[PDB]
Design a protein around this ligand. Sequence first.
Ligand SMILES: [Fe+3]
Length: 317
Amino acid sequence: SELNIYSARHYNADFEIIKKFEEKTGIKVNHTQAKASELIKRLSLEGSNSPADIFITADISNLTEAKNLGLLSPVSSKYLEEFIPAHLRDKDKEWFAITKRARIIAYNKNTNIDISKMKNYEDLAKAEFKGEIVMRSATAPYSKTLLASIIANDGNKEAKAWAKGVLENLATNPKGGDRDQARQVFAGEAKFAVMNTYYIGLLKNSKNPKDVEVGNSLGIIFPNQDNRGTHINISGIAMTKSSKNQDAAKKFMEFMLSPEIQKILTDSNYEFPIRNDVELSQTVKDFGTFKEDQIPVSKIAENIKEAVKIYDEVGFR
Ligand SMILES: [Fe+3]
């Protein structure tokens, strides 16, 4: 049992990546998957005695929460610092992006839909869109971090108004993740879905013909193009403080930023690579170009508590 990974990622593409690491290094990987909230509690209760070496997330704020709970340890790697831009890794060297993703607003491009008035995140909360929006639970990392970014940019008053309006505008109570919101848009149960870009790729390229149809129907609004740009989040990685296979851990972290693995992440999981010398997959190119929010993801995550607070006060959960 040579490397223990606790991962909140939820993608079949990761199995190939793991196997590739094992074949390269001879290290066997023990892969545990659960919700980030459950992995953080588990690392908290296991403490110093945890078998965990690596914590992997699909969200910045999950990494920062683990950090701020003393659950991680710094890794100083020339390899990671050379290929990951400073804005996409912890100043204190305890977490590191492996990919980027954008949380966008999707519509059914196989319909005539006026998207002229759905340009910014704030537009989701607008009375005119009552009954026309779908979004997953406020307890989801993607949901919490998106609201954190709205607080970071617009402050808590506007953020609360936004959360209230979104709640009031939901076509249905939240059910499932991003792909279920996409299915709702395909089916005509809602006009707009808040979702991550890579799910569009996963759907368009799915083994399931029904999901291919859903994916093929989706058009992308990259919100806030006229101003601050679209919300970016990261999938990221850290060494746990509990790590006893630290050699292997640092090897795996560097491996995640290697050319072939960054290529798999965009080719097979439709995410944006962190490395600036890896070609995007054709599906990802097809999402189109867009302006990104320039706020550091670390600063977003500083507003995570107020995000959970607001969602609670407004009546989510
Ligand atoms: Fe995801």
